[PDB]
Design a protein around this ligand. Structure first.
Ligand SMILES: Clc1cccc2[nH]cnc12
Ligand SMILES: [Cl-]
Length: 115
């Protein structure tokens, strides 16, 4: 079901290395719905190339537009299993401190602050 489950560590690593080669200015992001989530829909894909100059505040807007949410639906985004300390941080910086050992940046969203 989950990305890490579908692909071998060998396969996730080799894909991050191809994204470096072919989208060198992009951050490789895995974005997944909380497995408990009742309200928000599932995304159409799992793997996103994010421009490395966008801050986390702008990534949340992007995903809220991809889900086609409206202004009073709630949305919470975990990065590497934990809350974001700040939405002002550029994704290139977040990536360097929160990336996984396979080289993807893992994110999970829910309508409740409790995942
Ligand atoms: Cl949801 C989302 C996050 C980052 C970048 C994206 N491009 C298209 N959709 C995107
Ligand atoms: Cl690029």
């Amino acid at each position: 079901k989950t990305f890490k489950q579908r692909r071998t560590f060998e396969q996730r690593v080799e894909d991050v290395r191809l994204i470096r080669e072919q989208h060198p200015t992009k951050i490789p992001v895995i974005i997944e719905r909380y497995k408990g989530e009742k309200q928000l829909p599932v995304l159409d894909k799992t793997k996103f190339l994010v421009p490395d100059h966008v801050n986390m505040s702008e990534l949340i807007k992007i995903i809220r537009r991809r889900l086609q949410l409206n202004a009073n639906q709630a949305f919470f985004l975990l990065v590497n299993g934990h809350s974001m300390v700040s939405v002002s941080t550029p994704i290139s910086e977040v990536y360097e401190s929160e990336k996984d050992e396979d080289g993807f940046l893992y994110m999970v969203y829910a309508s409740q602050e409790t995942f």
